[PDB]
Ligand binder design. Structure first.
Ligand SMILES: O=S(=O)(O)OC[C@H]1O[C@@H](O)[C@H](O)[C@@H](O)[C@H]1O
Ligand SMILES: O=S(=O)(O)OC[C@H]1O[C@@H](O)[C@H](O)[C@@H](O)[C@H]1O
Ligand SMILES: O=S(=O)(O)OC[C@H]1O[C@@H](O)[C@H](O)[C@@H](O)[C@H]1O
Ligand SMILES: O=S(=O)(O)OC[C@H]1O[C@@H](O)[C@H](O)[C@@H](O)[C@H]1O
Ligand SMILES: O=S(=O)(O)OC[C@H]1O[C@H](O)[C@H](O)[C@@H](O)[C@H]1O
Ligand SMILES: O=S(=O)(O)OC[C@H]1O[C@H](O)[C@H](O)[C@@H](O)[C@H]1O
Ligand SMILES: [Ca+2]
Ligand SMILES: [Ca+2]
Ligand SMILES: [Cl-]
Ligand SMILES: [Cl-]
Ligand SMILES: [Cl-]
Ligand SMILES: [Cl-]
Ligand SMILES: [Cl-]
Ligand SMILES: [Cl-]
Ligand SMILES: [Cl-]
Ligand SMILES: [Cl-]
Ligand SMILES: [Cl-]
Lengths: 577, 577
């Protein structure tokens, strides 16, 4: 067992870490840092071609690459790690045990453009904005904005842009994503820019807008990528920025994120923490626990636990099928391997039909995978059918955790195994708890079968411009499949408190077995309804729904919309009427 | 020794080759095709991250990847291989012997946009063009041209654009490169498009323009990439298209290109053959022979034999130095290795100062290489000095070859070893025989020391809109170095015939030992002089130049310009007065 110790010796710690990690030989490593501030530049970092699910693949500069250990552990002792430019801070591949603790991650210059809206001229199609300085960086050239200008890198456009409350640093009431692609930007002097372009949705005067650049390059790497690993514990790890997601796990098992978080630095002038998901779990297995953590100000969801749907491309022989990934940021994924159990899904029926066990895999390229199964394939397997990995699904628990003031859904749940969401505090621009099995664009699997959402506080939820709900069960399945079959099952939503401004509470589509019980809804938020006459509850194409012992306080609101087939099995004790 | 034989079995030969080549196990392989037309798609091709000098690195789809053979041979028996989309047709890595023969290479849809210029409006900034159809592909979407729209790929803009003579399929007289970046293209009906943008140089009406797309993605891969191989023979191999160079060799030894070529298919509607260099030799050694070949209609040089200049970044210790690549398409190059001899060049002096021998190499990333030498480094080695690889330089012979009707220089010569250019037919838009050691942008090495250019025919040379010459000796060295030191040496230009229209014959800068003798210049080409009062010969900052027994026939032309220091050692027998 090797033990490496480090101190803040050089202005760029990357070469020192790079050299030490290269000479490691033992399969058990522990790295200790003396409490201090360490800066890492990518210039002299190791570079490898990497495959990163739900990010862009490519050549990456990597600061910490820990591959193949029996156990590897990083003790930050409260240090702060400052990164620079396009770099992947941490990669843990192929480790039988991983622990990182007591560390703060941040960048020296964020990959964002943040500006206060001074005025909007919709008639002439421009807006005037004052860019936030702090440690943001940008300039003008060619009549357009360039940012962040780090190591010679600049985005082409501001890209997808969102309006935030300047004081609360949360998304504005009614906020809608707006794509900025302006070729015409003037310096008006005194630090004011005039951005010429017509927008479908302009930002409100006085708000701060965020921009994270071009869709095709701004998912560079998460702060942590864990691949093919086991027994992973993050403890007192705080992320202030990343060029992608915060904690990303692929094909890994038994994960704990404890007393950790993704949020803004107290007193800073930052608006965005991670530019994508705070936490993300792609085809993991074993157990996942998020406890005592805090996720704020990301530009995407707080958590997404899900697997991959691959698409049957052709049948090779009686035991061998070739599948394809469906979304461009899934290519390069390690879908399966020897001894995995796999579900077959046959058009046009959305359900898991049968199970088989993988004998071997021939990865053809990053898009196509040839899988040979131990048992004969189903006779009805056809091109366009789906494979879902059955082995690589986790149990999932989130408790005593805060998720608020960010862009997107708080919690996105797609595992078929036991899921517990309890004793959390939630506040979400979009839906708070969202279910979306997806075979249309994202190809993310996860018809659920056992989910308990209880004793949480939902405060200020679903204030986006587009319609959302506190609990939103909404699969989006390819038109090659029937659109009215039961998908998710056995969801319980018990004893939560919802502070509301008139938003939807539950929207359920194709759920079989949904209990909404013991909840208190407090219409006590002074903000305007953005979708008039939205019911508290709406159910379409579902079965065995029960409303029980809920309470509504405040100005009246439409309670129920239910279609005829769901009404047939709706138990409703009239708790709210 | 394995022998694989194939026949035109399926619409897509890629899977059959992929599977067969994956199961080869002997170190001696021969692949035989029955004479026919074979088509290869990238969809199911193997994908690997590849490093390709003077191209862009990244994930490549690869049809033939032959790695590590004692001997590998491909016998095409006159077959035609048709490729499709973004694919690398052939890769030969780490092979002790390579032979390819009797094969024609082409694409089903070229990655070019070609159009006849119908009208130009310089006041309003537009041009009307009719796209050539043939097997070109393109459309309009978002108000601009998309091409080639193959497997979902399209360039952003037309990119680097050049005008050609419709009937000769060569660059127009006075042709100049023009960047096309037009956001506004409309269909005027009748197969005519209007391209809105202001150009510094407009194409002439009646000319065909070629466009090859965005600078940053159009160097995808050469038709052939040969890396770390030796004893390589191409014989009767013809290339009609590639997404890059035709024959590219890196760190390879003893190469012959015999009875081969890069040119347009007779009777086709193509204008461009390869979108980059026909042949290219990056830090090869041993001998290179090009004989009885034919290179036409490329969008870059016919041949460039050259090495790499790396830049000293850091002195690590008494024996170890870290260098950096200078041009962005050189990163990932394999600069050196154990037992290589290396030249050191110390600012501000351009000359090779001392030699050392490499003990080991520690590749840090694609930009930075750490080199440990067997002997102590020079005391005066400093950041910004250069290393040149001394071992990896070849002898070079081109004979009985035709190079004409393409964009750029015919032959670019940067090896220090014996070079012979004889009995060829050259016609060139730019300079025909060009010398450019380059430590400013391209970082390409070789001050030459022994070059013989004799018994060639130069017919219609240097008709570009910018000034060039039949023989052009023009280093381009960083301002960190003295700008008036002798660089190239011992160049002889003997017994050639030049049909001229008034162009320069010799422009020489910083040569020591130049002989121009026995040449016949016939002013017999009916084309306008574009650079008036250009002398036949011009020498600056050179030594030991001799004009001897030359003859000029036709309308009078200024003969000589020479600075005072070159005049001091110029021998001129007045044969051209
Ligand atoms: O993101 S991954 O592609 O899985 O990275 C792991 C791989 O990195 C690649 O760059 C290497 O060439 C492979 O040997 C392998 O180690
Ligand atoms: O990550 S994004 O760039 O916003 O993805 C864009 C996509 O969003 C999806 O919800 C739509 O179904 C797609 O048709 C596409 O518009
Ligand atoms: O262009 S090169 O980088 O030299 O290619 C050779 C390499 O390809 C990479 O994709 C592999 O991970 C390496 O194992 C090696 O095979
Ligand atoms: O082939 S290209 O890469 O588009 O050429 C662009 C380059 O041309 C060179 O001659 C210039 O000196 C460089 O400064 C650079 O602009
Ligand atoms: O189908 S979903 O509506 O849940 O969207 C899936 C999508 O959610 C987030 O945008 C992530 O950043 C993406 O990588 C992807 O997981
Ligand atoms: O310094 S030079 O003027 O000879 O230019 C070097 C340059 O020449 C061609 O453009 C090649 O395609 C490039 O890869 C590069 O070799
Ligand atoms: Ca990816
Ligand atoms: Ca390259
Ligand atoms: Cl190292
Ligand atoms: Cl900077
Ligand atoms: Cl920010
Ligand atoms: Cl692929
Ligand atoms: Cl219904
Ligand atoms: Cl295969
Ligand atoms: Cl196509
Ligand atoms: Cl063409
Ligand atoms: Cl690099």
């Amino acid at each position: 067992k090797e033990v490496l110790t480090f101190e803040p010796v050089a202005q760029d710690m990357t070469p020192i870490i790079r050299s030490a990690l290269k000479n490691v030989k033992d399969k058990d490593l522990k790295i200790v840092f003396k409490k201090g501030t360490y800066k890492f530049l990518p210039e002299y970092a190791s570079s490898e071609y990497r495959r990163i699910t739900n990010h862009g693949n490519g050549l990456k500069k990597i600061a910490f690459s820990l591959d193949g250990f029996d156990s590897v552990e990083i003790e930050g002792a409260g240090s702060e790690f400052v990164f620079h430019g396009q770099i992947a801070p941490f990669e843990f591949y192929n480790n039988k045990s991983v622990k990182v603790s007591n560390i703060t991650i941040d960048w020296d210059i964020p990959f964002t453009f943040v500006a206060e809206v001074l005025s909007v001229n919709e008639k002439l199609g421009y807006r005037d904005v004052r860019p936030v300085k702090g440690d943001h960086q940008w300039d003008l050239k060619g009549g357009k904005i360039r940012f962040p200008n780090v190591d010679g890198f600049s985005y082409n456009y501001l890209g997808s842009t969102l309006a935030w409350d300047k004081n609360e640093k949360r998304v504005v009431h009614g906020g809608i994503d707006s794509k900025s692609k302006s070729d015409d930007v003037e310096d008006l002097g005194n630090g004011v820019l005039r951005i010429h372009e017509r927008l479908k949705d302009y930002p409100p005067v006085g708000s701060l807008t965020s921009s994270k650049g071009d869709r095709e390059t701004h998912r560079y790497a998460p702060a942590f990528q864990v691949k093919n690993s086991k027994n992973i514990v993050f403890d007192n790890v705080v992320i202030h920025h990343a060029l992608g997601m915060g904690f990303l796990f692929e094909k890994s098992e038994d994960i704990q994120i404890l007393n950790s978080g993704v949020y803004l630095r107290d007193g800073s002038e930052r608006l965005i923490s991670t530019t994508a998901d705070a936490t993300h779990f792609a085809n993991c297995k074993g157990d996942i626990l998020i406890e005592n953590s805090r996720f704020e100000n990301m530009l995407d969801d707080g958590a997404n636990v899900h697997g991959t749907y691959t698409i049957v491309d052709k049948i090779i022989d009686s035991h061998t099928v070739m599948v394809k990934f469906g979304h461009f940021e899934q290519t390069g994924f390690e879908f399966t391997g020897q001894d995995d159990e796999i579900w077959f899904i046959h058009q046009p029926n959305t359900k898991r039909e049968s199970v088989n066990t993988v004998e071997s895999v021939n990865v053809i390229n990053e898009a196509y995978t040839q899988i040979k199964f131990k048992n004969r394939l189903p006779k009805q397997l056809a091109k366009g059918d789906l494979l879902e990995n059955k082995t690589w699904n986790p149990t999932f628990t989130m408790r005593k955790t805060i998720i608020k003031n960010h862009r997107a859904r708080n919690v996105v749940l797609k595992t078929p195994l036991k899921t517990v969401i309890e004793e959390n505090f939630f506040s979400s621009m979009m839906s708070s708890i969202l279910f979306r099995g997806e075979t249309f664009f994202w190809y993310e699997s996860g018809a659920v079968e056992d989910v308990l959402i209880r004793n949480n506080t939902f405060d200020y939820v679903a204030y986006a411009g587009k319609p959302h709900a506190v609990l939103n069960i909404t699969p989006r399945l390819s038109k090659s499949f029937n659109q009215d079959e039961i998908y998710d099952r056995n969801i319980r939503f018990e004893n939560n408190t919802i502070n509301s401004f008139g938003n939807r509470i539950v929207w359920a589509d194709r759920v079989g077995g949904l209990t909404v019980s013991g909840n208190t809804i407090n219409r006590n938020i002074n903000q305007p309804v953005l979708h008039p006459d939205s019911p508290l509850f709406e159910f379409v194409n579902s079965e065995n729904i029960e409303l029980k012992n809920n309470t509504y306080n405040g100005k009246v609101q439409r309670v129920l919309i239910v279609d005829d087939s769901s009404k047939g099995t709706l138990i409703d004790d009239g708790s709210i009427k």
